[PDB]
Amino acid sequence: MLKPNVAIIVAALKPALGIGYKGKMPWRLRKEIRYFKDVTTRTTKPNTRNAVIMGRKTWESIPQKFRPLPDRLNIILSRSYENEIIDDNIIHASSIESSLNLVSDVERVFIIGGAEIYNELINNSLVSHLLITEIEHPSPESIEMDTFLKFPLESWTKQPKSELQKFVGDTVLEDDIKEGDFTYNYTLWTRK
């Protein structure tokens, strides 16, 4: 795969864009988790799959019985990894571009975490799309949080819902989804 268009997909709590606490997610949003599964899995043409790329810490935070994430090519980045094809579902590498070099029959490429990876790749021109689940809470400062996105969104344009709908195909997009004290919306951003 040469110069793939890449999408960041993330769920973040406004206004600070917190995404984690001591190596874990600060919430469990069932519908959001299903959205993530559906969007990263879905392909528009037959006989392809998508790639999901993540940092070593995020990979390790998926319980071992539940990785690799099914139906997607999983790529894990570590500074200690030489290039290695582990199996048909798992690749080890030290950059996104090198990891995708011998990869074929992949449609979309998603960056799925975590903070360090997101905060590097936001300034990688291969990333053309941000799929940000914008989470709100009445008292956001009360949620324990130590891990944040550093996204210069001034350089980005939040697209209308019609663009997000086109991107996700027939995936149902509900507005102002409420779980416990959290309210959320799915968004799509592109570069200016």
Ligand X SMILES: NC(=O)C1=CN([C@@H]2O[C@H](COP(=O)(O)OP(=O)(O)OC[C@H]3O[C@@H](n4cnc5c(N)ncnc54)[C@H](OP(=O)(O)O)[C@@H]3O)[C@@H](O)[C@H]2O)C=CC1
Ligand Y SMILES: COc1cc(-c2ccccc2)ccc1[C@@H](C)C#Cc1c(C)nc(N)nc1N
Q: Which residues bind ligand Y (CB under 6 A)?
A: 9-11, 32-33, 36, 54, 58, 61-63, 66, 112-113, 133
Closer to ligand Y by CB, 4 or 37: give it: 37
Closer to ligand Y by CB, 32 or 147: give it: 32
Number of H helices, E strands in the chain: 5, 12
Closer to ligand X by CB, 1 or 145: give it: 145
**Separation of alpha carbons 113 and 75, rounded Å:** 11
**Separation of alpha carbons 74 and 52, rounded Å:** 5
The enclosing H or E element of 13 equals strand 6-13
Residue 3 CB, shortest distance to ligand X, in Å, is 18
Residue 25 CB, shortest distance to ligand X, in Å, is 4
Q: Which residues are annotated as a binding site for substrate?
A: 32-37, 72, 112, 118
Give the Cβ contact number of residue 156 at 10 Å.
16
Binding site for ligand X (CB under 6 A): 10-11, 19-20, 23-25, 54-58, 61, 77-80, 94-95, 113-117, 120, 147
Closest CA relative to residue 37, chosen from 61, 66, 60: 66
